[PDB]
Design a protein around this ligand. Structure first.
Ligand code: OS3
Ligand code: OS3
Lengths: 232, 232
């Protein structure tokens, strides 16, 4: 019965800026493994906030550091994502129920795409945290979608790649970190929730949309993440 | 002036089997984060041996665990790889001077392939360890090549992808973990050496070659890694 330690992660500095602002507490900055961890006290909880830097290796490293070096008991991810489905519009929020590494390819050995031996195609997130997210969204009258998020080390900006992610994985959104964060948490037995707000449609205009909406979408996700932390 | 702690990593169980056999000491098995770490004493050094499981996320996690949980001061990687160049034949040994994540693509933002903001295309390994490898190889009359290794989350088995790795990155060999291991070590300031023995030619017949030569090539790499540890 110590103080609860909660890890809060984004991929980009822009994804954690609104998180730090919204919590409004003093943070100690602690450098480790190329990341800066922002350690603060919020209600009866220790919150450790960081951005990993972009992509799967960065996010895997940072999540592992949060767990081993800072002793976090839960990890909440907040950031932006590309939409793969018509009903997920710019600014909409989605919670990932499962995630996949969409760029993994061991098909030379007849493995399905996404699969690595001693693992699985789909990585689950925390049912209790996802239930909390849904409960809060319903009380606040916020549309919150749930579905599969695909993660890879490419920025997706083509109709062809979008359609593959939908056909192969039944994914709803695409990003570059969720699956790796969720994977690390699964390996250590740490509950994980991945929240994303849509910044673009993962098509030919995605780069321009992303630049336009990163701030607003990052804020939308951050505000929702704070509302979850308020109930922990 | 404690005992030197050396991390020894492979990707697959088959890559560490000969390592454990060759060191010939008693190991304590310690489970953590979905890996099993084999901790032993060899001469005046503590050796921590593990296989990460395949690919970039697995290897990033395991390397981070080795550094944070086991306090390793150096990391030596041993395993097998696909050859991209005519002069690297089955069983030949290569030490990686730089590594790249060949599947990273942020070209939508006009970044070169392999590049992520706040990082670099090429990750360096330890010059002092690579010099040690070359010195030992020369004394033992072992051909040891050096060059760039490309790492990604795909098993490469096509002429077309091989040629891309050579054209884009001037890579000599391909695998799925070196760049991520070397990256983590760079972030923590830990010296890293990546050794690989060729198992296949990364072409249409690579899967069959890999299955045939994994054992022999893994042993070749392991034997050389042991010879390095003998000089540390
Ligand atoms: C800085 C800079 C330019 C490179 C930004 S890469 C895109 C970042 C946003 N994030 C989520 C994302 C939003 N739209 C996406 C898309 N269309 N494809 C992949 N990921 C995303 C992944 C990564 O951290
Ligand atoms: C078990 C099993 C079947 C899947 C094995 S994936 C290949 C493993 C060997 N390793 C190195 C490698 C050897 N030949 C390769 C190739 N042709 N492409 C990518 N990696 C490799 C990467 C990964 O750990």
């Amino acid at each position: 019965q110590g103080v609860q330690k909660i890890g809060i992660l984004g991929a980009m500095r822009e994804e954690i800026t609104p998180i730090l602002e919204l919590f409004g507490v003093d943070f100690e900055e602690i450098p480790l493994g190329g990341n800066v961890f922002h350690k603060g006290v919020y209600h009866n909880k220790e919150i450790i906030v960081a951005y990993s830097k972009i992509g799967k290796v960065h996010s895997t490293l940072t999540t592992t550091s949060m767990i081993l070096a800072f002793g976090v008991q839960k990890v909440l991810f907040s950031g932006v994502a590309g939409s793969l489905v018509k009903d997920l519009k710019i600014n909409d929020l989605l919670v990932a129920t499962q995630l996949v590494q969409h760029d993994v390819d061991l098909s030379a050995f007849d493995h399905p795409l996404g699969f690595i031996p001693e693992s699985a195609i789909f990585i689950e997130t925390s049912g209790s945290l996802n239930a909390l997210a849904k409960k809060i969204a319903n009380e606040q009258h916020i549309a919150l979608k749930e579905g599969v998020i695909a993660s890879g080390d490419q920025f997706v900006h083509s109709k062809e790649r979008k359609e593959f992610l939908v056909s192969e994985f039944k994914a709803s959104a695409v990003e570059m970190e969720g699956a790796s964060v969720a994977f690390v948490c699964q390996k250590f037995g740490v509950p994980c929730c991945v929240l994303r707000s849509i910044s673009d449609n993962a098509d030919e205009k995605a780069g321009m949309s992303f630049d336009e909406f990163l701030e607003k979408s990052a804020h939308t996700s951050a505000k929702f993440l704070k509302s979850m932390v308020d109930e922990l």
